[PDB]
Amino acid sequence: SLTVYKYEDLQNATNFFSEENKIKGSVYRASFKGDDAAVKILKGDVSSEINILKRINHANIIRLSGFCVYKGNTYLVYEFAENNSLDDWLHSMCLSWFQRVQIAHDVADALNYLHNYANPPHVHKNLKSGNILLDGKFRGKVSNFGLARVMENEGGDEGFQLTRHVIGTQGYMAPEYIENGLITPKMDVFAFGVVILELLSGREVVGSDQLLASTVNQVLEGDNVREKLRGFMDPNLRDEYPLDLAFSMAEIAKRCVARDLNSRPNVSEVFMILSKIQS
Ligand SMILES: Nc1ncnc2c1ncn2[C@@H]1O[C@H](COP(=O)(O)OP(=O)(O)NP(=O)(O)O)[C@@H](O)[C@H]1O
Numbered sequence: 357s358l359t360v361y362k363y364e365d366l367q368n369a370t371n372f373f374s375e376e377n378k379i380k381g382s383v384y385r386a387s388f389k390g391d392d393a394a395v396k397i398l399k400g401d402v403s404s405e406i407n408i409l410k411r412i413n414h415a416n417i418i419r420l421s422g423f424c425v426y427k428g429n430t431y432l433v434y435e436f437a438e439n440n441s442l443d444d445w446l447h448s449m450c451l452s453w454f455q456r457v458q459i460a461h462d463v464a465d466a467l468n469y470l471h472n473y474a475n476p477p478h479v480h481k482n483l484k485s486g487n488i489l490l491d492g493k494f495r496g497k498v499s500n501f502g503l504a505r506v507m508e509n510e511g512g513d514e515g516f517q518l519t520r521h522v523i524g525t526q527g528y529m530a531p532e533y534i535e536n537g538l539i540t541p542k543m544d545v546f547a548f549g550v551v552i553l554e555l556l557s558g559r560e561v562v563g564s565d566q567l568l569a570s571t572v573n574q575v576l577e578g579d580n581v582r583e584k585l586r587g588f589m590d591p592n593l594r595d596e597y598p599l600d601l602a603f604s605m606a607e608i609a610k611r612c613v614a615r616d617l618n619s620r621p622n623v624s625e626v627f628m629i630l631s632k633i634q635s
Pocket residue numbers: 378379380382383393394418434435436437438440441484485486487489499500504
């Protein structure tokens with residue numbers, strides 16, 4: 357039943373939605389009850405979707421405190437994630453090697469829960485650096501896994517950024533989806549592969565137009581792999597990383613970004629890999 361909220365308490369926490377808003381028009385910061393939160397405004401009663409998706413709770417998934425339906429709109433209150441999104445940090449203090457490995461581990465931990473032990477399993481479909489939030493200890497918190505996906509919303513929209521949805525599509529989406537709409541948990545594995553590549557290189561998923569998911573193959577192929585990998589590594593790490601474990605992590609990302617979905621590993625395997633190379 358989560359926690360039923362009175363719309364009043366939401367107005368006061370958000371200063372009556374007084375450009376206390378985070379970037380997203382529907383995303384506001386609510387300061388109240390000591391622990392801060394984030395309020396997302398959604399059109400129409402989406403209560404039915406919550407009663408299904410509310411099954412998904414995990415330490416590394418953005419937690420839903422509750423919801424409120426007021427005058428034809430649904431206001432959802434999530435745990436506030438200070439330090440914003442991984443994209444902000446990778447494309448802007450800099451995340452150390454330890455932190456980058458921790459974040460990859462939390463995401464693999466959440467993807468492992470979603471694909472196997474969520475009752476029933478659920479495919480994310482929208483795993484991106486911008487959706488992976490961080491908390492005060494820079495731990496991962498997956499977010500836009502439902503109802504915020506482009507065509508998952510029952511109430512369609514025309515306040516839509518086409519060029520932006522398409523940029524993320526080419527950089528994160530697996531080929532079997534772009535070509536046939538084939539939706540399997542392997543598409544999350546492909547996306548998760550690109551995230552790791554972002555964590556290792558800090559590069560844009562689509563650079564200035566080469567995709568970050570095709571460069572890892574050239575970096576690990578042929579000869580002089582050590583030198584090509586050093587150059588691939590994020591400069592901001594400044595040698596403060598074990599090149600051995602970086603190559604290993606880059607290897608598990610290449611398998612994740614393979615074109616054949618059945619060749620890709622299950623996230624459960626990636627979760628076991630990241631846990632053994634962790635501190
Ligand atoms: N629970 C939360 N805690 C803190 N910040 C949040 C939370 N949910 C969303 N945000 C912020 O709200 C913005 C994104 O809102 P969102 O509804 O996810 O749309 P979005 O634009 O698709 N996400 P993004 O990929 O980062 O641009 C980002 O600046 C996030 O940091």
